[PDB]
Amino acid sequence: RGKWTYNGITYEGGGGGGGGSAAEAYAKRIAEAMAKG
Known part of the structure; x- marks a missing residue:
């Protein structure tokens, strides 16, 4: 899918x-x- 924001900060790698x-x-x-959870 691609990076997915959580709380403003973005991700990169997964x-x-x-x-x-x-x-x-x-x-x-x-x-x-x-x-x-």
């Missing part, structure tokens, strides 16, 4: 992106799920 978006298909959602 999301290498080299080959296929394989790991970026399941491991991309996992986070979401785990994103409950």
Whole structure:
């Protein structure tokens, strides 16, 4: 997706992106799920 702001400050790094978006298909959602707190 790309950098995502949180509290003003921006991010840069998360999301290498080299080959296929394989790991970026399941491991991309996992986070979401785990994103409950």
